[PDB]
Design a protein around this ligand. Structure first.
Ligand SMILES: Cc1cc(Cl)cnc1N1CN([C@@H](C)c2ccccc2)C(=O)c2c(O)c(=O)ccn21
Ligand SMILES: [Mg+2]
Ligand SMILES: [Mg+2]
Ligand code: NA
Length: 348
DNA sequence: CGCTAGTCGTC
DNA sequence: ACGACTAGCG
């Protein structure tokens, strides 16, 4: 997520009901739904008892979209990016410590506090995702596991024209350049739609409404690939890009303290991390499910070299990318857990 | 005062 | 891994 982005661009948002997309295609950031579902059966998931309540949760939202004539494409996160492996292991450690804290709370009679604890102790596994995939496939619902982040895969589906809107709780999708993003959608279909075309309605953005400048602002403000410099949020990131007249973002960032009248010494690792974050939003690997090929989100541009971009996702053979996309190949172990083949029955 | 970030409650 | 909200900083 980009902290505060939704409130900063409030004027580009409008309340909608998903009926608006009747006869259209919509891609879903399914781990958001798996998460809410896993909270509803957290005591069983953390301890180790078998449960499928999270499956019923996701299918309630899938069945609501289908009732309104919407063709949903459920996208799932895949492999972790190299730069996020310490983060994903640190998350496992906090979830296991919250499981121990919850057990301790139940022993002290604090049942309500322990039940809360368990909700922050759950791991969303590929095996949980695969159960949702199977349930959705029986209903005729297409599923796709992104090679890496679902954010990039979803942005690809929308930029390519396959889907007309992205349902997600993550404002990163706006930074990736999605045209229509549906945030805060409830089980009944009510939600907040942000349209990229309406970014011009936001007086706070000024001229920071182009895809390039908007992405730069989101990165400078603090993003999932790079924390901000201290004292920098959306208002100051936007102010810097508004005041600067220069195509080169690297020169602008070095001069950041001057534009804001702040004491900012820009570290060496900040400039490099910025270029890496920018390259991740631009060139992260996604899967074209029609041609069944692993490709970068955008075609490579003049100032980059693909061999330096392992942090944006490593290439694997197209056949391996296809087994991952169908849900047949476990994202953590690389074991073949299923044999689904779309031919012998999105991928057409 | 505008803004950012630390605290706290919950999904 | 959220947001609300306010203290407290520049
Ligand atoms: C660890 C985590 C928890 C929650 Cl509530 C939300 N996001 C989480 N993570 C991980 N994740 C997926 C795998 C994922 C989403 C939901 C649950 C587990 C994994 C993401 O999609 C993701 C982002 O895109 C982002 O910008 C920041 C953080 N996360
Ligand atoms: Mg994501
Ligand atoms: Mg994200
Ligand atoms: Na920030």
């Amino acid at each position: 997520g980009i902290q505060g982005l939704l409130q900063f661009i409030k004027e580009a948002s409008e309340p909608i009901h998903v009926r608006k997309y009747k006869g259209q295609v919509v891609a879903v950031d399914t781990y958001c739904w798996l998460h809410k579902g896993a909270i509803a059966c957290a005591e069983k998931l953390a301890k180790g008892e078998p449960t499928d309540r999270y499956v019923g949760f996701c299918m309630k939202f899938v069945n609501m979209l289908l009732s309104h004539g919407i063709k949903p494409i459920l996208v799932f996160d895949g492999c972790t990016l190299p730069s996020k492996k310490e983060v994903e292991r640190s998350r496992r450690e906090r979830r296991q410590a919250n499981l121990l804290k919850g057990k301790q709370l139940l022993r002290e009679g604090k049942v309500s506090e322990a039940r809360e604890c368990f909700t922050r102790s759950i791991n969303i596994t590929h095996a949980m995702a695969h159960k949702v995939i199977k349930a959705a496939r029986s209903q005729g619902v297409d599923c796709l596991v992104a090679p890496y982040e679902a954010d990039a895969q979803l942005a690809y589906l929308n930029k390519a024209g396959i889907v007309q809107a992205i349902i997600t709780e993550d404002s990163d999708l706006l930074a990736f350049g999605c045209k229509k993003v549906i945030l805060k959608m409830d089980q009944f279909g009510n939600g907040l739609e942000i349209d990229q075309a309406r970014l011009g309605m936001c007086r706070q953005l000024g001229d920071v409404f182009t895809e390039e400048k908007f992405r730069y602002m989101c990165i400078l403000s603090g993003c999932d690939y790079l924390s901000s410099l201290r004292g920098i949020g959306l208002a100051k990131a936007c102010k810097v890009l508004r005041l600067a007249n220069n195509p080169d973002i690297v020169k602008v960032i070095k001069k950041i303290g001057h534009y804001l009248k702040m004491n900012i010494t820009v570290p060496e690792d900040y400039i490099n991390g910025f270029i890496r974050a920018n390259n991740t939003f631009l060139y992260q690997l996604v899967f074209d499910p029609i041609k069944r090929k692993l490709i970068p989100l955008n075609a490579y541009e003049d100032d980059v070299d693909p061999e330096t971009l392992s942090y944006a996702g490593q290439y694997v053979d197209d056949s391996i990318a296809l087994q991952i996309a169908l849900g047949n190949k476990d994202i953590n172990t690389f074991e073949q857990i299923d044999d689904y083949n779309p031919d012998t029955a999105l991928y057409f």
